[PDB]
Amino acid sequence: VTLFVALYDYEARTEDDLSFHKGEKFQILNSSEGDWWEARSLTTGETGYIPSNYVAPVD
Numbered sequence: 001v002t003l004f005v006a007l008y009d010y011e012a013r014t015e016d017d018l019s020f021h022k023g024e025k026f027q028i029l030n031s032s033e034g035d036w037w038e039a040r041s042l043t044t045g046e047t048g049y050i051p052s053n054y055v056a057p058v059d
Contacts, residue, residue, distance in 0.1 A: 004055050018048025
């Protein structure tokens with residue numbers, strides 16, 4: 001289970017970066033190293049690069 005859980009919302013005022021909310025789930029897709037990964041949601045279907053290093057999965 002490499003699924004990440006949303007913690008809170010974020011205020012992104014850019015083009016690359018996007019805003020998101022909690023209660024959603026993000027699927028893996030990117031595999032560079034550990035920085036800005038994509039956020040694939042099976043809900044809205046909106047991508048965006050953000051730092052989801054402050055979150056955590058569910059065991």
